[PDB]
Amino acid sequence: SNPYQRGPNPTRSALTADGPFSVATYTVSRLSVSGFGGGVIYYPTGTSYTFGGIAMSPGYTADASSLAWLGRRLASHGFVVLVINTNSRFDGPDSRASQLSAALNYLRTSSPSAVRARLDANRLAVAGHSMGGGGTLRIAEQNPSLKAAVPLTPWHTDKTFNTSVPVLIVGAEADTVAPVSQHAIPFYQNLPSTTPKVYVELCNASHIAPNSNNAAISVYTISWMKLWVDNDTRYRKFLCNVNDPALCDFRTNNRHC
Ligand SMILES: [Cl-]
Ligand SMILES: [Cl-]
Ligand SMILES: [Cl-]
Ligand code: NA
């Protein structure tokens, strides 16, 4: 059952480190693509399977290298992951949405053949840090064919996204760039009631928490991607009956359980 299932039955411990797939990397040069600033593709190798794809945006003033750990982490668990650079480091969230959109098209149609050979372009998702997370929400509303969206410490001046795409938001309790009371939490609250949604808040974390190896970010991001991109219900257990000392808030409409 479940043609999209990949990898062994997950343990929490396994979700805090790189997963069972070898990872190859491909540099998309800034100049080779119109529509976004290039970036890095992390993707499985040594395997004949195909996997869902993820496009991921860094945050305000940041480089793709800021999320290299997470692009590798996700790919190692069985995903083709393009972390973009933006046209300008100063691009705001809706610009970043457009670039995510361009990056998804690139992955499906123009990436190298070794990358295309590993991708099932019918199963795509988005993620992003900060302002890139605001772009993640925007694109999830503009393009409901996406399977999942994971905004990390998100920032956006618009607070309401009417998307049917399953959303997991990571807030940081001590975030002073994108305070959870103005940003992360309104975003969660204002999503449709009928959309599967989860909000997790990291205790004692700032806005820069996504920029380095983080166990909670790893577990929840992998789990939400597996659950919806792969329909992999083996990951429901990390997202249901949650009791996690790493978190200082948790909210869900429990449609995913
Ligand atoms: Cl092969
Ligand atoms: Cl913008
Ligand atoms: Cl197409
Ligand atoms: Na500008």
Author numbering: 2 to 258
Give the exact sentences the study uses for this entry:
Computer-aided enzyme engineering performed by Tournier et al. introduced an Ile at LCC position F243 to enhance the enzyme’s catalytic activity by further expanding the substrate-binding site.
After successfully implementing a batch crystallization setup for ICCG variant L50Y, ICCGY mutants were generated according to strategies to either increase crystallizability (Q6E and T110E) or, as a control, not to increase crystallizability (negative controls T26E, Q183K, and Q238K). ICCGY mutants Q6E and Q238K did not crystallize under the tested conditions within 56 h, rated as “inferior” to the ICCGY WT. No interaction partner could be identified for the mutants T26E, Q183K, and Q238K within the standard range of electrostatic interactions (<4 Å), as intended for the selected negative controls. Furthermore, the crystal contacts of the three mutants remained comparable to the ICCGY WT. The negative controls T26E, Q183K, and Q238K, which did not aim to enhance interaction at the crystal contacts, showed no increase in crystallizability. The consistent space group among the crystallized variants of this study (ICCGY and mutants T26E, T110E, Q183K, and Q238K), all crystallized in batches with identical conditions, emphasizes these assumptions.
